[PDB]
Each structure stands twice: as structure tokens, then as C-alpha cells.
């Protein structure tokens, strides 16, 4: 509790509070940018999935986990990895592909030989279909996607700004699509692989929507978290400020005494 220390101690917190307050305001603008891509993706989810509402399609499991590589955003990855283990109880031997490292790191520790593929370099900018297609493609590629009895994507749904929600959604494959109760209503010409395509493109599209929602749920979290960091380092600064003045003060008195005593003699 020397003065030298307390000073620099108090500095590096001010310097932290700065960064955290920059973080918060930067997220505010970034959430505005990813707000419009969560309306333009959750609308294309409308036109797409409505066909599925009319021909009610009801579904070696493939779970795809979605987050990012970024920390500093509260329990985004922590509590998504938990709902993924909650569902990974009922099928201990279900394959996972993870998008974003923080989730991979989480599950890698608990179902370490479930995962077969992993993607990275994600939650930096807003996700685009270009990615959403390449991951869908590689899921078809190495992962043998269509040849799976069942596929479900796991993502963080954004309920408000302050709170998000771990969520799940079903992908259905070629066979499920043909076999759906009201498929008969739709005069889709059996003119060559037609349900296949619908699947291959509902895998990219569904995936996108999830990613858009996941990212915009994460940005909210990052914002809120960084926000509290600023409040705390704010309160810490206050404490150390008080401690600083004490030490200063005594440094003056103890220093002075040394002289007074030297002087009386």
C-alpha cells in the first residue's frame, strides 16, 4: 500500500474504464447495424418456412452449434453450451459441428469425442449468405449431411437487448420433405431432384437466420457486459482515489516527522 504502487494501480483502472466505455458505445453502433440484418433474415425465414407450415414436415444426429470466437460478452457461450448438453443427454453419441471457437472450447471439455468438424473467424462482422452457404456446403461435403436421420441447429435467440435465449430449431432432410403429410397439396413437378434442393437451401437459409440472430444476441450481450465493467471500474476508481489521498497524506506526515526528530537533536 505504498504511494508508488497505489498511483499506478489507480492509473491502469482508469485506463481499463476507458476501454470498457469505448467498448460499450462501439457495441451500441454495431447492434444498430446488425439490427437490420436480423429483420432482413427473419423475414426471409418467413417466405421460406411458410411452405413448411402448410405441408407440415415432422422430423446419427447432427447438432450444429453457433456462437463466435470472441469472449468479453457474458454467458453467451456458457449457457448455450449447457442447453447443448441438456439435449446431448438424450443422445450421448450425436455428432457436432461448431461455429465459433468459444462454444467448441466449451463442449471440447465435456463431450470431447462427439465433435467431428469446426469452423472459425465468425462473430467479427455480420454473417452473410456467402458464409452460410459455404458452411452448408461443407456440412454436405465432409459431414455427409443429407445422410443424417436428424439435424438441429443451436443458437442464441435475442429476446430483448438485456436478455437472450439459448434456442434450437429443426432442419428437415430430403426424405422428411417428401414424406410430409401435406406434400401432396403442392403440385411440385417430380421433374428431377426437387426436394433435395429445397433441403440443401433450407440448410443454408436456416443456418443464416440463426447466425444473424446469434450475432445480434451476442452484440447485445457484449454491450451489456462492457457496460457493467465500466460501472465497476467506475466504483473501483472511487475507492482507490480515497485510498490514494490517505497514502499521499501520511507520506507527507511520516516524511515530515523524520525531519522534525532529526531537527530537535
Amino acid at each position: 500500500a505504498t504511494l508508488k504502487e497505489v498511483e499506478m494501480r489507480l492509473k491502469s483502472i482508469k485506463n481499463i474504464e476507458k476501454i470498457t466505455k469505448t467498448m460499450k458505445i462501439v457495441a451500441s453502433t454495431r447492434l444498430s447495424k446488425a439490427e437490420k440484418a436480423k429483420i432482413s433474415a427473419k423475414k426471409m425465414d418467413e417466405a421460406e418456412q411458410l411452405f413448411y407450415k402448410n405441408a407440415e414436415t415432422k422430423n446419427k444426429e447432427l447438432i450444429v452449434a453457433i456462437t463466435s470466437d470472441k469472449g468479453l460478452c457474458g454467458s453467451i457461450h456458457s449457457q448455450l453450451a449447457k442447453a447443448v448438453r441438456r439435449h446431448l443427454n438424450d443422445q450421448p453419441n450425436a455428432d457436432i459441428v461448431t461455429i465459433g471457437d468459444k462454444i467448441k472450447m466449451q463442449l471440447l471439455r465435456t463431450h470431447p469425442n462427439n465433435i467431428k468438424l469446426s469452423i472459425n473467424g465468425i462473430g467479427k462482422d455480420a454473417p452473410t449468405f456467402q458464409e452460410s452457404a459455404l458452411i452448408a456446403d461443407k456440412l454436405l461435403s465432409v459431414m455427409k449431411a443429407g445422410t443424417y436421420p436428424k439435424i438441429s441447429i443451436f443458437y442464441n435467440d435475442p429476446v430483448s437487448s438485456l436478455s437472450f435465449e439459448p434456442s434450437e430449431k429443426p432442419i428437415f432432410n430430403a426424405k422428411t420433405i417428401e414424406q410430409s403429410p401435406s406434400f401432396g397439396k403442392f403440385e411440385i413437378d417430380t421433374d428431377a431432384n426437387v426436394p433435395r434442393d429445397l433441403f440443401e437451401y433450407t440448410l443454408a437459409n436456416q443456418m443464416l437466420t440463426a447466425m444473424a440472430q446469434g450475432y445480434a444476441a451476442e452484440i447485445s450481450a457484449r454491450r451489456n457486459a462492457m457496460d457493467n465493467a465500466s460501472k465497476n471500474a467506475g466504483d473501483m476508481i472511487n475507492r482507490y482515489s480515497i485510498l490514494y489521498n490517505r497514502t499521499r497524506q501520511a507520506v507527507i506526515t511520516n516524511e515530515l516527522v523524520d525531519i522534525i526528530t532529526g531537527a530537535s537533536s
Binding site: 481499463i16 470498457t20 469472449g71 468479453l72 457474458g74 454467458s75 456458457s78 466449451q106 471439455r109 457486459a225 457493467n228 465493467a229 465497476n232 471500474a233 473501483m236 516527522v257 526528530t261 530537535s264 537533536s265
Partner: protein
């Protein structure tokens, strides 16, 4: 628990309680008198230096009631009192009177003597009170220049010798809550087990408000307590020390930014921490819960189980202010209803 497990006291050794004002050195000592002094048989010498006369009047009531002091019977203890109302000469001395009495019981009548001093700080504070008027140039923090050797003369007398054992507990006061003040700094090197009270820890409502990380004893050695008690100790400390290292990240970022292994340690350390708290019978008029005494073998097992995570699934609160591991499973069932 904290002592038994972490910094074991030694028979015929020198024990000291460090702490600032109102952390509980006095109540802690009364718990030690409670346990040891009853089933001890031999002679005790209690010395009130610079404390409250209330406290001394209370201790004289307390003994006549347990029967340690029997006005009409025999008696196991002796009372010497130079209390905080006394002039600095009185208080600069009264402890030497206590000591002389104990030294007789040790050397002449070859006895096991229990010797409680409270508070030994008040002897060195008195030394400074007079020192300038004695014409002396002061020393750092305005203490008598003789503070070390005047303590060495007194402390070096409170001792076991080839003619008789003495166990002594001394209450150490800590000016301004500063441990590096030259009075307590110099004390430490005179003790065999040192157990410190943190103000902060008491403000957590943890009692005894010991510092699990600052308390020491020469007796925590495998050659004495044995590999397991030795290891249950270290591992407990690593856990607590880690919690301590993270106090900053958790203060700003909170828990969500910790990794997985880190996260566990904290929840575990916070349990170990609460479990180190123990209801004291003497302090009953402050908890409300009738006090508990755990045993050494009892404590070690209990903690070992927690460190093997055999209780992770129990709300942190269960570990707070109860006896041994049995009491944890009890309170947790009570609350889970």
C-alpha cells in the same frame, strides 16, 4: 476448524492472536479457555493487560460459575489485572507480575501452565507513552527506541523450559489495522503459531474471522500432522489463493469471464471459505445458534471430501456457520425444504 486444520497449535508452545479492534481476539481466546482450560487439570494464569474492566469483571463472574474459581473450594486459575484505566507505569508492568506467577508454577512446582495474556500489545503501547518523558529520542512511528529488546526480555521469559511446560495464548492488538506497525511486526518472531483476524472477513460475517492465508504454525508439517492432513491443507490453500488471485477480474468482469476450471475453484473456494466459519459456544449471544466443536480427524476428512468435490451439488449457504460435514448435509436438507 481453521486452527486444527491450517495452523495447528502446539502443547507448551507460544500462540498469538493478531487483530485490530473488534475483530474478536477476546472472544476467540474465551473459546480457547472454554475448551482447553476445562479438561487441562493443571494451573492457569490469566492476565488482563490494558483491556476493559467490564471484561475482567465478567471473567471473574464466568469462573465462579464454571467452578474454575471456587471461593470456598480449590481453584485452577489466577487473576492479574492492569486494565486500560491504569497509568502507563502500571500497564508497562502488570504482565511481568502475571509472568512471575506462571514462572513459579513452571519451575518450582513443575506444572503444566496455561497462560493467557490479553492484551500484550498494551505493554508496548505503555512503553511509548512514558518514553519521551524518560528523555529518549523517538524511533519509527514514535516508538521507544528500545521496543524490540524490551519485548525480548518479556517474551523470552514466557516459555517452556526443561523444568516445566507452558502453553500460552497471547492476544495481539494491531494498531490502525496495520500489520506492519512496529509493535506487531516485532511480536511475530516470538510465536510458534500465529493466527490473524481480518476486519474484512468479519464484515463478511465469517467467524472466527481468521485469515486462512496469513495464519501459520510450525506444526503443520507431515512429520507431525501426517501426509493427508498436510495435503488436505495445501490443496485448501491453493484453492483459496486462486480465489484471491481472481478477486480483481471478478470485481470488474464478474464470473462469466472466468474459464471453466477457474469457475469451479471459485465456487469451491467460496464453500471452503464459509465452511471455515464455526459457531462458538461463548459467542452464542451473537450468532444465536448454539456453538459447535469439531475434532481434528473430523475436520480433515470433512475438507478432503469437499476438495474431492463430493459436495459440489450443495448450496454455498449450507457450509456457513455449522460444525462438521454432517451438519452441512443436515442444513442443506433443511433448506431444500
Amino acid at each position: 476448524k481453521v486452527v486444527d486444520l491450517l495452523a495447528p497449535y502446539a502443547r507448551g508452545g507460544k500462540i498469538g492472536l493478531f487483530g485490530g479492534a473488534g475483530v474478536g481476539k477476546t472472544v476467540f481466546i474465551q473459546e480457547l479457555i472454554n475448551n482447553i482450560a476445562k479438561a487441562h487439570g493443571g494451573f492457569s494464569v490469566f492476565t488482563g493487560v490494558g483491556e476493559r474492566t467490564r471484561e475482567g469483571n465478567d471473567l471473574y463472574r464466568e469462573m465462579k460459575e464454571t467452578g474454575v474459581i471456587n471461593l470456598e473450594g480449590e481453584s485452577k486459575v489466577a487473576l492479574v489485572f492492569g486494565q486500560m484505566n491504569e497509568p502507563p507505569g502500571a500497564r508497562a508492568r502488570v504482565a511481568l507480575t502475571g509472568l512471575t506467577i506462571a514462572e513459579y508454577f513452571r519451575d518450582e512446582e513443575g506444572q503444566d501452565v496455561l497462560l493467557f495474556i490479553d492484551n500484550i500489545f498494551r505493554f508496548t503501547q505503555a512503553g511509548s507513552e512514558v518514553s519521551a518523558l524518560l528523555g529518549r529520542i523517538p524511533s519509527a512511528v514514535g516508538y521507544q527506541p528500545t521496543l524490540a529488546t524490551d519485548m525480548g526480555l518479556l517474551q523470552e521469559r514466557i516459555t517452556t523450559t526443561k523444568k516445566g511446560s507452558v502453553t500460552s495464548v497471547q492476544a495481539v492488538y494491531v494498531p490502525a489495522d496495520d500489520l506492519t506497525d512496529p509493535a506487531p511486526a516485532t511480536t511475530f518472531a516470538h510465536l510458534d503459531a500465529t493466527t490473524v483476524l481480518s476486519r474484512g472477513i468479519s464484515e463478511l460475517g465469517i467467524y472466527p474471522a481468521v485469515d486462512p492465508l496469513d495464519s501459520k504454525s510450525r506444526l503443520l508439517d507431515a512429520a507431525v500432522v501426517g501426509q493427508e492432513h498436510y495435503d488436505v491443507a495445501s490443496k485448501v490453500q491453493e484453492t483459496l489463493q486462486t480465489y484471491k488471485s481472481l478477486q480483481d477480474i471478478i470485481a470488474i468482469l464478474g464470473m462469466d469471464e472466468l474459464s471453466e476450471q477457474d469457475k469451479l475453484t471459485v465456487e469451491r473456494a467460496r464453500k471452503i471459505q464459509r465452511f471455515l466459519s464455526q459457531p462458538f459456544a461463548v459467542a452464542e449471544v451473537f450468532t444465536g445458534i448454539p456453538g459447535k466443536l469439531v475434532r481434528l480427524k473430523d475436520t480433515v476428512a470433512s475438507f478432503k471430501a469437499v476438495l474431492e468435490g463430493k459436495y459440489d451439488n450443495i448450496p454455498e449457504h449450507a457450509f456457513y456457520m455449522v460444525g462438521g460435514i454432517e451438519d452441512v448435509v443436515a442444513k442443506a436438507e433443511k433448506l431444500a425444504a
